CSV table of N, CA, C and O in Angstrom, one decimal:
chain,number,residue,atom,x,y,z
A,1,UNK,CA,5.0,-15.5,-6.2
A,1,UNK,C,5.5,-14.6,-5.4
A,1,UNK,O,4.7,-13.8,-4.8
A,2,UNK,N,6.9,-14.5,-5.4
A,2,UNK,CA,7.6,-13.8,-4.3
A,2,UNK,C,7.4,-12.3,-4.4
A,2,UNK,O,7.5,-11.6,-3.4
A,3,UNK,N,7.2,-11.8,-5.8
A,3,UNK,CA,6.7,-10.5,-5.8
A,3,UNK,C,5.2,-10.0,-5.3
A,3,UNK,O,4.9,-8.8,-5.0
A,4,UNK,N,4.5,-11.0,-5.4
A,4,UNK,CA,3.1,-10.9,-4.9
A,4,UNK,C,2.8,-10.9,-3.6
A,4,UNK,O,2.3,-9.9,-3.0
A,5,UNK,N,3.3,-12.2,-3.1
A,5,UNK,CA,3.8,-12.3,-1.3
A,5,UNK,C,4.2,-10.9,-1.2
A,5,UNK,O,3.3,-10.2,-0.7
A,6,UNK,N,5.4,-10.0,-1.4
A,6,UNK,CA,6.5,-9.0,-1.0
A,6,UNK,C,5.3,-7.6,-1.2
A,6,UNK,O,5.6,-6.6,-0.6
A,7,UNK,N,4.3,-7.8,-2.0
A,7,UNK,CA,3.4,-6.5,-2.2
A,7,UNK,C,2.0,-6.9,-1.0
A,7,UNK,O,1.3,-6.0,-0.4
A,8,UNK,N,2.0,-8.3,-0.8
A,8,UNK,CA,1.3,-8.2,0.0
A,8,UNK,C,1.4,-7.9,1.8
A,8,UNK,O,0.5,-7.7,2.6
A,9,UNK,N,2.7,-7.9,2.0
A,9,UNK,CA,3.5,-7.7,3.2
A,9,UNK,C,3.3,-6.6,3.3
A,9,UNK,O,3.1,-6.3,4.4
A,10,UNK,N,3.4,-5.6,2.3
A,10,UNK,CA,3.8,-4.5,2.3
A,10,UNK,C,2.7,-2.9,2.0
A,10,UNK,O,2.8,-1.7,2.2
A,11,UNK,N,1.6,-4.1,1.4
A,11,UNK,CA,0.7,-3.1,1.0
A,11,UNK,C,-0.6,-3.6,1.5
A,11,UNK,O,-1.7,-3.0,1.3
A,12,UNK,N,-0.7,-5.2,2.4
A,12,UNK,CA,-2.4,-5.6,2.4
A,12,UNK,C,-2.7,-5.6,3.6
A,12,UNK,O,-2.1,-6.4,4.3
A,13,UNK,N,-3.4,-4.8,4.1
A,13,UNK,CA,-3.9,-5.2,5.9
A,13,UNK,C,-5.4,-5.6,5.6
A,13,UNK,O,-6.1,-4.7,5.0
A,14,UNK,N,-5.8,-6.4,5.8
A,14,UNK,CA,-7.6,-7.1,5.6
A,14,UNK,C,-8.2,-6.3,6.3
A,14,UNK,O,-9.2,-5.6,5.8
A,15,UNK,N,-7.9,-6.2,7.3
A,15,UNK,CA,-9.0,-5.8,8.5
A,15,UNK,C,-8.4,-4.9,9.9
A,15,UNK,O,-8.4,-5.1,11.1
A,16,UNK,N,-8.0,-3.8,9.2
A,16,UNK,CA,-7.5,-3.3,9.8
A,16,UNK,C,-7.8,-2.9,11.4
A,16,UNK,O,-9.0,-3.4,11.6
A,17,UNK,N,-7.3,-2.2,12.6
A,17,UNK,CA,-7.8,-1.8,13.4
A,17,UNK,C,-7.3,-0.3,13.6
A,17,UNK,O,-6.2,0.1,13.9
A,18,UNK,N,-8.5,0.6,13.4
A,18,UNK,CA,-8.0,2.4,14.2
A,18,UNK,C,-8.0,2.8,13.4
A,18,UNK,O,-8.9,3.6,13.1
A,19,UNK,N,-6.4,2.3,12.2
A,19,UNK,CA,-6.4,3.1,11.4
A,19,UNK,C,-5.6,4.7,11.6
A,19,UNK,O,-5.6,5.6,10.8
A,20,UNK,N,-5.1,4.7,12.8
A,20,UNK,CA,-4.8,6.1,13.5
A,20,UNK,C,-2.9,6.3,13.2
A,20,UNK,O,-2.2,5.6,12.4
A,21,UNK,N,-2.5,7.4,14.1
A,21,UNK,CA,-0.8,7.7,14.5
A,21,UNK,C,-0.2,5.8,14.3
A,21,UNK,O,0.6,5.1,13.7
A,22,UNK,N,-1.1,5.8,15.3
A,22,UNK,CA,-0.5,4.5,16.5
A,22,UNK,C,-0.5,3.2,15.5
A,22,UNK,O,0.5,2.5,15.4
A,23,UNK,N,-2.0,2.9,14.7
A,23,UNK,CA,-1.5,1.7,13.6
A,23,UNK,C,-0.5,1.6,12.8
A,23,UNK,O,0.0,0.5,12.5
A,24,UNK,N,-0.1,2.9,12.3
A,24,UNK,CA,0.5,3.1,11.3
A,24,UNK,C,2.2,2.7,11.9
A,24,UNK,O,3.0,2.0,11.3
A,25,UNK,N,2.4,3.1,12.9
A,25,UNK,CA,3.8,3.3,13.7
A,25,UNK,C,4.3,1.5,14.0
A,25,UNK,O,5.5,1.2,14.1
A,26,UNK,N,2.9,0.5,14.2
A,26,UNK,CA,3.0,-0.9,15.0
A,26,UNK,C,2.7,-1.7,13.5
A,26,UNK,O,3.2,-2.8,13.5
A,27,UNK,N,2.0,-1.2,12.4
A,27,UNK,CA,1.5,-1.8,11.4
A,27,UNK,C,3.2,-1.6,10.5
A,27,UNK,O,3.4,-2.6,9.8
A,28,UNK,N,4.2,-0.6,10.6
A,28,UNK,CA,5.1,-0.1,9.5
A,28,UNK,C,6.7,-1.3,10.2
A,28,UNK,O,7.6,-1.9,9.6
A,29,UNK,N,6.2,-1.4,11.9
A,29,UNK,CA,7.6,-2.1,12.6
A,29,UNK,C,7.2,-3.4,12.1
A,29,UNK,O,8.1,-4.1,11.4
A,30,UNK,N,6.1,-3.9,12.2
A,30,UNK,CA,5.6,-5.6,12.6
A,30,UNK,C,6.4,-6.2,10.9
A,30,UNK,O,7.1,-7.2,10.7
A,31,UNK,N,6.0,-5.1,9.8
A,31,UNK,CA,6.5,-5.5,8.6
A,31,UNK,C,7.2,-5.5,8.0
A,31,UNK,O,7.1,-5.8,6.8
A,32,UNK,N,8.4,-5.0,8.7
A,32,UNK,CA,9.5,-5.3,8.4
A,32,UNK,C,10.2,-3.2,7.8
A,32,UNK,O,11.3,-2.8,7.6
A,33,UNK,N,9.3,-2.6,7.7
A,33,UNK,CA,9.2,-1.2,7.1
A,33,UNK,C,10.1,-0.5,7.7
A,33,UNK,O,10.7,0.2,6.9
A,34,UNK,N,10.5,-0.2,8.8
A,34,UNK,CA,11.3,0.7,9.6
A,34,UNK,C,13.2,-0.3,10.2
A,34,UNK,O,14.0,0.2,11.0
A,35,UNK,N,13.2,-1.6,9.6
A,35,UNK,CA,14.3,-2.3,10.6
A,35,UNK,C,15.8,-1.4,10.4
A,35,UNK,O,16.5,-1.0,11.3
A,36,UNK,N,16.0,-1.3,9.2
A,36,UNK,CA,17.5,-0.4,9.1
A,36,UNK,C,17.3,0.9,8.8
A,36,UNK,O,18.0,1.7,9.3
A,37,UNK,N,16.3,1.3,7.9
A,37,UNK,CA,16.2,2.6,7.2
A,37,UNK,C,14.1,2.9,7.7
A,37,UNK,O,13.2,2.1,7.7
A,38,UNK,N,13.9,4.2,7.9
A,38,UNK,CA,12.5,3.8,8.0
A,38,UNK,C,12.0,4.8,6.5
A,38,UNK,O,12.3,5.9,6.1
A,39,UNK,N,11.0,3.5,6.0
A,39,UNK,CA,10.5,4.1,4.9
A,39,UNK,C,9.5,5.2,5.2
A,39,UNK,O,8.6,5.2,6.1
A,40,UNK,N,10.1,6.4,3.7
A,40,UNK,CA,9.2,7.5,4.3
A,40,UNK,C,7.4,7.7,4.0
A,40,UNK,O,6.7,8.7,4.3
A,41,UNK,N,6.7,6.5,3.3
A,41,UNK,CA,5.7,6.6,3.0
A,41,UNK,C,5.2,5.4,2.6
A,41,UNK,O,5.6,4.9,1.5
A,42,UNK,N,4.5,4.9,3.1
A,42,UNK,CA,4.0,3.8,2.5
A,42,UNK,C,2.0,3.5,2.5
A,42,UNK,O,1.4,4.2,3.3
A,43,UNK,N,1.5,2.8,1.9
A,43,UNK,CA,0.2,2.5,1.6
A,43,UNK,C,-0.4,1.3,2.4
A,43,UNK,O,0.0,0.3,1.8
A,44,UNK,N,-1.0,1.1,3.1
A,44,UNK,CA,-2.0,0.1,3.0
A,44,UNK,C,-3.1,-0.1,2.4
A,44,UNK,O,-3.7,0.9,2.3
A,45,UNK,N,-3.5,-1.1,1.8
A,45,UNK,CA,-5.1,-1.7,1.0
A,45,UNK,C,-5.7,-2.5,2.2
A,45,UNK,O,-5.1,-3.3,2.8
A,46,UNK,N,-7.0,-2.1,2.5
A,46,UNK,CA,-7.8,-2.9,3.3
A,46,UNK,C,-9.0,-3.4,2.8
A,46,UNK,O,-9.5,-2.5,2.0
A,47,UNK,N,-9.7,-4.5,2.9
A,47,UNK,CA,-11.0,-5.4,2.4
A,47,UNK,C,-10.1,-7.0,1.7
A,47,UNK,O,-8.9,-7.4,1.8
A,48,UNK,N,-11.1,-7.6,1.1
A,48,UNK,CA,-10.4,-8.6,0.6
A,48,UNK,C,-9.3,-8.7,-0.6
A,48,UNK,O,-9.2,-7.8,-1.4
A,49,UNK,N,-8.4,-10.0,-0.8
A,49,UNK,CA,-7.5,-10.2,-1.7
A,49,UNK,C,-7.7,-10.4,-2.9
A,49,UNK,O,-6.8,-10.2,-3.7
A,50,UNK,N,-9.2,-10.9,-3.0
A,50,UNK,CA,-9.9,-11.4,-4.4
A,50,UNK,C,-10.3,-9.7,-5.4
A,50,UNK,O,-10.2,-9.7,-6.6
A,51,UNK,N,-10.6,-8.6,-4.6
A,51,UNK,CA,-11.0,-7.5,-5.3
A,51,UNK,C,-9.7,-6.9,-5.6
A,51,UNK,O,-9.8,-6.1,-6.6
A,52,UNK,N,-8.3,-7.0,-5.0
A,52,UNK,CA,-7.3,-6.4,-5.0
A,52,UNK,C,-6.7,-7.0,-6.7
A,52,UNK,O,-6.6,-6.4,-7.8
A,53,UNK,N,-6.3,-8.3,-6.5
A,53,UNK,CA,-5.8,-9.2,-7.8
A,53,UNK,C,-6.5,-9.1,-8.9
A,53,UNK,O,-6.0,-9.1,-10.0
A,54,UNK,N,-8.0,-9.0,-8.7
A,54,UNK,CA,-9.3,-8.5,-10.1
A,54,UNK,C,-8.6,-7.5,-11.0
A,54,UNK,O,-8.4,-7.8,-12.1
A,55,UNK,N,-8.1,-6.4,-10.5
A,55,UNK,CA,-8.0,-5.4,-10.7
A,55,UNK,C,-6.8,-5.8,-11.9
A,55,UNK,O,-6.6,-5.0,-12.8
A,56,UNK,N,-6.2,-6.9,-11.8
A,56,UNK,CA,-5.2,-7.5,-13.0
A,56,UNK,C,-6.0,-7.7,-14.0
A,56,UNK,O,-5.5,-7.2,-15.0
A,57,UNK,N,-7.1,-8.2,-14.2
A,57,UNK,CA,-8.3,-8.5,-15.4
A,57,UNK,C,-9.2,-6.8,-15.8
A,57,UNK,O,-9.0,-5.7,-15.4
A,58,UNK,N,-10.1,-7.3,-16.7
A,58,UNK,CA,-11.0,-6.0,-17.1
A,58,UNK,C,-12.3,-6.4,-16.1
A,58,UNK,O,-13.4,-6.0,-16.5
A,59,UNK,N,-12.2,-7.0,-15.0
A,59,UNK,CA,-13.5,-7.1,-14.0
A,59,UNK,C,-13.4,-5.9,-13.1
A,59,UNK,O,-14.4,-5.3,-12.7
A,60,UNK,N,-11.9,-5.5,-12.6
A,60,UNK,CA,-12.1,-4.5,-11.5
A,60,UNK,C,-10.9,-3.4,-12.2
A,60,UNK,O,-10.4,-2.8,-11.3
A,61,UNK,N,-10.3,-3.0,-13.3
A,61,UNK,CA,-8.9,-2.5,-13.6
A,61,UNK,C,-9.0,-2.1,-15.6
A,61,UNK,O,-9.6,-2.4,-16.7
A,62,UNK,N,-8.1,-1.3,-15.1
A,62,UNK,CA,-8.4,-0.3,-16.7
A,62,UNK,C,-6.6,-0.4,-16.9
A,62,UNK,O,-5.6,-0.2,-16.2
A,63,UNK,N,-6.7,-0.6,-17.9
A,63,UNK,CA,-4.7,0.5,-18.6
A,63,UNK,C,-4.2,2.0,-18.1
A,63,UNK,O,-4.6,3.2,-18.3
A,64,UNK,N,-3.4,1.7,-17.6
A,64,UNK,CA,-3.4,3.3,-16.9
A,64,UNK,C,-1.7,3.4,-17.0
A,64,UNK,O,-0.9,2.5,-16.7
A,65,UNK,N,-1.2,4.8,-17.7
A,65,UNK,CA,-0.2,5.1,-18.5
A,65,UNK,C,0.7,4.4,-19.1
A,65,UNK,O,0.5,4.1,-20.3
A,66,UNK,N,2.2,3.9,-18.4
A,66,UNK,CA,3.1,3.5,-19.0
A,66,UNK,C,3.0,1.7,-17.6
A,66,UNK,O,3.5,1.7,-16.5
A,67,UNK,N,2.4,0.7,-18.2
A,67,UNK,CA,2.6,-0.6,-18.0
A,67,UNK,C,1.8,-0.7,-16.8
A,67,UNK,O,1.7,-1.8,-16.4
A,68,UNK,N,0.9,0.4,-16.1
A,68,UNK,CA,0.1,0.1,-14.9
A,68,UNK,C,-1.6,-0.1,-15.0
A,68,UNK,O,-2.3,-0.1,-16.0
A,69,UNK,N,-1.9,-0.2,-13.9
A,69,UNK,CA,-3.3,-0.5,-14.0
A,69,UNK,C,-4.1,0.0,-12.8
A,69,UNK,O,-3.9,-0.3,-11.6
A,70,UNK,N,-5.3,1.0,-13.1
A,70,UNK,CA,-6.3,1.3,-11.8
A,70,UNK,C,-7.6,0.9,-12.0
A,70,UNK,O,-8.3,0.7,-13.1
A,71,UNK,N,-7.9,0.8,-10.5
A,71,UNK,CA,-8.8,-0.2,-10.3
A,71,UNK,C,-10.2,0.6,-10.8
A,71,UNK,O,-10.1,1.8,-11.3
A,72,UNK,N,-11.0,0.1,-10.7
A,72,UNK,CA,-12.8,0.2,-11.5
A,72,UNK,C,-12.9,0.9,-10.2
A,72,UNK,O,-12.8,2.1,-9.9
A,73,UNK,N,-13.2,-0.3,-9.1
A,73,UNK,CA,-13.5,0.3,-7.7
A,73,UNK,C,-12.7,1.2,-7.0
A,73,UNK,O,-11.6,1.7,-7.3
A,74,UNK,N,-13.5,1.4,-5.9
A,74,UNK,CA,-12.6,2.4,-4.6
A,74,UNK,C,-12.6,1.3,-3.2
A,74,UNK,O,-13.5,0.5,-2.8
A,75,UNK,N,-11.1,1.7,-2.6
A,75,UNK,CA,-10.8,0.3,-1.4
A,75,UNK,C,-10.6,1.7,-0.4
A,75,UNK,O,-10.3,2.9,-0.7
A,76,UNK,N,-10.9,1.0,0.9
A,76,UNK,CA,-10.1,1.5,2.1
A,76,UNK,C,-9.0,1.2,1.6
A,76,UNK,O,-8.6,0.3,0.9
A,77,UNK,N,-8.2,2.7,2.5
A,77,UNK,CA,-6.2,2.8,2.3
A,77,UNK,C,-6.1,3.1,3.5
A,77,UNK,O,-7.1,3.2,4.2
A,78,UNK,N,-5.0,3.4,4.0
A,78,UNK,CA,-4.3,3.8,4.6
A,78,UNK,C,-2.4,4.5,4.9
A,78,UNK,O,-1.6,3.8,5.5
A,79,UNK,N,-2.2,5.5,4.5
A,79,UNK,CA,-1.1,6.4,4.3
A,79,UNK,C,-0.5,6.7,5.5
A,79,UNK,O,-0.8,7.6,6.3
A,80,UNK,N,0.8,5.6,5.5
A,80,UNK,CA,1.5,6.3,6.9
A,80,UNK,C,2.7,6.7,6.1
A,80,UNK,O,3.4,6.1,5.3
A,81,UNK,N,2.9,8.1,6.7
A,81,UNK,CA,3.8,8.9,6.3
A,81,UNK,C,4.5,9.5,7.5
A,81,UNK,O,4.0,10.2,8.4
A,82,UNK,N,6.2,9.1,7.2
A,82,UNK,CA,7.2,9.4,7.9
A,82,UNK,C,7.2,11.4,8.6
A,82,UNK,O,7.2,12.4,7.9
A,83,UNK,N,7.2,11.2,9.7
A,83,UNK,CA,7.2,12.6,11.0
A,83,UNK,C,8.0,13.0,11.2
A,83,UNK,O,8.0,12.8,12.4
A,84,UNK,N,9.3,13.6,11.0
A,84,UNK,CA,10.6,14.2,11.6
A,84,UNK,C,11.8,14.6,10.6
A,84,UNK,O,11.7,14.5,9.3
A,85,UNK,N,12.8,15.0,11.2
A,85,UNK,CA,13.5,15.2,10.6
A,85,UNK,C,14.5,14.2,9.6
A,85,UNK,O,14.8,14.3,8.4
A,86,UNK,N,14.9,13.3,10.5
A,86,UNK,CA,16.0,11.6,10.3
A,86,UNK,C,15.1,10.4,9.4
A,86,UNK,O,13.9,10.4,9.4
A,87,UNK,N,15.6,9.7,8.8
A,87,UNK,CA,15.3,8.7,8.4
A,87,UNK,C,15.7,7.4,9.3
A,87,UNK,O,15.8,6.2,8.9
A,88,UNK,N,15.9,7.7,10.5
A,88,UNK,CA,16.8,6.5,11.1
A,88,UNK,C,15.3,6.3,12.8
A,88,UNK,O,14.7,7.0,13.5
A,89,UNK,N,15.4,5.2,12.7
A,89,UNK,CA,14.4,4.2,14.5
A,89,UNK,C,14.9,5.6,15.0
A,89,UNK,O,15.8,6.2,14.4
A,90,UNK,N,14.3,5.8,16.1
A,90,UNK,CA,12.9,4.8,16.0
A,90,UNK,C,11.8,6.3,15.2
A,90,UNK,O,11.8,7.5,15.3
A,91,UNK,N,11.0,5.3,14.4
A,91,UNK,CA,10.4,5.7,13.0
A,91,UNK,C,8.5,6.4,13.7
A,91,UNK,O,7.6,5.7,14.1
A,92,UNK,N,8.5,7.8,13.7
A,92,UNK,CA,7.3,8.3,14.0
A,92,UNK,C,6.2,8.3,12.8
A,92,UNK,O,6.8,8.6,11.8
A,93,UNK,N,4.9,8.1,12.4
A,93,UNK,CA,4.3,8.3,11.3
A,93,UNK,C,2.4,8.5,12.1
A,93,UNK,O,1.7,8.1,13.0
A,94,UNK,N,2.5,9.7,10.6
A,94,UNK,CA,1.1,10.2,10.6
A,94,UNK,C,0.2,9.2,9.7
A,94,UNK,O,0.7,8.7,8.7
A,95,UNK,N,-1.2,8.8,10.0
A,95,UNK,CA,-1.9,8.3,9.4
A,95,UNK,C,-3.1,9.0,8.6
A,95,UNK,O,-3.8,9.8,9.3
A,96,UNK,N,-3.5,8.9,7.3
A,96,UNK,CA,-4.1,8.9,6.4
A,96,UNK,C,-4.9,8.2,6.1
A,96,UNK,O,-4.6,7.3,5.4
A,97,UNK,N,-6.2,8.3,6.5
A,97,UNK,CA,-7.1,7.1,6.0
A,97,UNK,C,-7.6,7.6,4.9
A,97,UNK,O,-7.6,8.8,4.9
A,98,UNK,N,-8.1,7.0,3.7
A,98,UNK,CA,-8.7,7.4,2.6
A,98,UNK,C,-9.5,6.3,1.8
A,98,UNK,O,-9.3,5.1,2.2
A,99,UNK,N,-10.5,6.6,0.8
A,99,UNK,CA,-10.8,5.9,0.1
A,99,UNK,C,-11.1,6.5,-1.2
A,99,UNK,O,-11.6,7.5,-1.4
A,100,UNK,N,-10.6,5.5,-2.2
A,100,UNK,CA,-10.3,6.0,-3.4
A,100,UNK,C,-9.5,4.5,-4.2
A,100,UNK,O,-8.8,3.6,-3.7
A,101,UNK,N,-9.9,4.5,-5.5
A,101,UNK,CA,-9.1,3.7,-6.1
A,101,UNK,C,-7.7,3.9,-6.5
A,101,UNK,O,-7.0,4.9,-6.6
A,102,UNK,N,-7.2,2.3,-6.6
A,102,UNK,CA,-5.4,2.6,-6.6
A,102,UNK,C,-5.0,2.0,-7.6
A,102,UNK,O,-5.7,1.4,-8.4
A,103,UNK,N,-3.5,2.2,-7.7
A,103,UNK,CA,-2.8,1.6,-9.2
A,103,UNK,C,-1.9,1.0,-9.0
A,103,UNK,O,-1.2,1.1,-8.0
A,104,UNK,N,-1.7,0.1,-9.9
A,104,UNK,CA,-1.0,-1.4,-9.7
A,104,UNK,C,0.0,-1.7,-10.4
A,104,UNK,O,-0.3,-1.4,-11.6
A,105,UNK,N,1.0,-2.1,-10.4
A,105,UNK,CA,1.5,-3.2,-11.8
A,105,UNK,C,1.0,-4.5,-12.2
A,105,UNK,O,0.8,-5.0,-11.1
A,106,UNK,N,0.7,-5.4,-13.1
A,106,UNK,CA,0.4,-6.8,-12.3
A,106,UNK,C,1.5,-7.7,-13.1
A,106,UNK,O,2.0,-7.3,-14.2
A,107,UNK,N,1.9,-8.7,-12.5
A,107,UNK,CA,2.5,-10.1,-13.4
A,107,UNK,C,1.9,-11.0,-12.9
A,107,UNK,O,1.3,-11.4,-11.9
A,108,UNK,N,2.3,-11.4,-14.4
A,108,UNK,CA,1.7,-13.1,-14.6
A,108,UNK,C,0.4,-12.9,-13.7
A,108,UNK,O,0.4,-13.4,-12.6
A,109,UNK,N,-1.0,-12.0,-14.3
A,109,UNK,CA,-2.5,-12.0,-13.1
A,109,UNK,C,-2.4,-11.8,-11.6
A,109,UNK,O,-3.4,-12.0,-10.8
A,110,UNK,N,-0.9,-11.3,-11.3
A,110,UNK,CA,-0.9,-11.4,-10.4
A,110,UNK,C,-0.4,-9.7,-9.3
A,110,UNK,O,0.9,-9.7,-9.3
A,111,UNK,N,-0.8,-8.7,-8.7
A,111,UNK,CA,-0.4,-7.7,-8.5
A,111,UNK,C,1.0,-7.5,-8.1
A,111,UNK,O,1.1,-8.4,-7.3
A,112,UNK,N,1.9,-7.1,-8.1
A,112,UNK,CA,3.9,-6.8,-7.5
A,112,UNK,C,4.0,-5.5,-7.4
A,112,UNK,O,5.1,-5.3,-7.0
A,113,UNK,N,3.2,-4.4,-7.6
A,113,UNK,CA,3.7,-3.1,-7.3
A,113,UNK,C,3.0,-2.2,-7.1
A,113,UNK,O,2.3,-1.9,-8.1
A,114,UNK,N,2.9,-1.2,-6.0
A,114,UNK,CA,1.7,0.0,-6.2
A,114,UNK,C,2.1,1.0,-6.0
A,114,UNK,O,2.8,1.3,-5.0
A,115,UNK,N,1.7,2.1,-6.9
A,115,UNK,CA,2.5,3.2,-7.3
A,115,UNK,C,1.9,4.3,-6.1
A,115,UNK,O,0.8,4.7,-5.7
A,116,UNK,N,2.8,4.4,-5.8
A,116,UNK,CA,2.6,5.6,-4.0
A,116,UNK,C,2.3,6.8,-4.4
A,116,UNK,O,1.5,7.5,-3.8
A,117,UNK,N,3.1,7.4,-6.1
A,117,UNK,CA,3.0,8.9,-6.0
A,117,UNK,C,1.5,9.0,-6.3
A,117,UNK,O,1.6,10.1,-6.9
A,118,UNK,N,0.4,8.6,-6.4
A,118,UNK,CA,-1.1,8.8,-6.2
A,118,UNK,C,-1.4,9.2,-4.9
A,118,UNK,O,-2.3,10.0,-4.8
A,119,UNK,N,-0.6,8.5,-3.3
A,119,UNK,CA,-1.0,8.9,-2.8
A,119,UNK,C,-0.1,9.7,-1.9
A,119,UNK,O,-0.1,9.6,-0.6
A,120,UNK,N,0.8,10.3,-2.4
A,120,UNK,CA,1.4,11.6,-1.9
A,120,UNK,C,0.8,13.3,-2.2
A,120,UNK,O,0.9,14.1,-3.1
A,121,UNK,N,0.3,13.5,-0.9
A,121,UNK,CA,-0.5,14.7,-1.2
């Protein structure tokens, strides 16, 4: 898993489209990101699920400080970050495309967490 599902809701778009203002704003509602409180930053990972979960083993992922892990590779991302003054709907966001490798927690082989302040910024 439920933590794995819940990172993947939250952090996996496969195949994204644009990538712009506008994905980020339709990509943050569809998933649940903005319904009571809108979150002020969040990440997408784009390409497949098999390179994302690697990154739990020594195939794609290194030890990286206190209990996390970054990947060998670099993924398409995407950073939408909260526009205004309020935290409250309806939720404006700027988009960030980037590529660069990212950092993870994993359980049980499996990824639950990705650490944002890398891509704050």
């Amino acid at each position: 898993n439920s933590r794995y599902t819940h990172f993947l809701t939250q952090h996996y778009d496969a195949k994204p489209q644009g990538r712009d203002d506008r994905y980020c704003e339709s990509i943050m509602r569809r998933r649940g990101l903005t319904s009571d409180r809108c979150k002020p930053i969040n990440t997408f990972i784009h390409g497949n699920k098999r390179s994302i979960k690697a990154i739990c083993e020594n195939k794609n992922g290194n030890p990286h400080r206190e209990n996390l892990r970054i990947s060998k590779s670099s993924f398409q991302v995407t950073t939408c970050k909260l526009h205004g003054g309020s935290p409250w709907p309806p939720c404006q966001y700027r988009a960030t495309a980037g590529f660069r490798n990212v950092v993870v927690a994993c359980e049980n082989g499996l990824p639950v967490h990705l650490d944002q302040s890398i891509f704050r910024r």
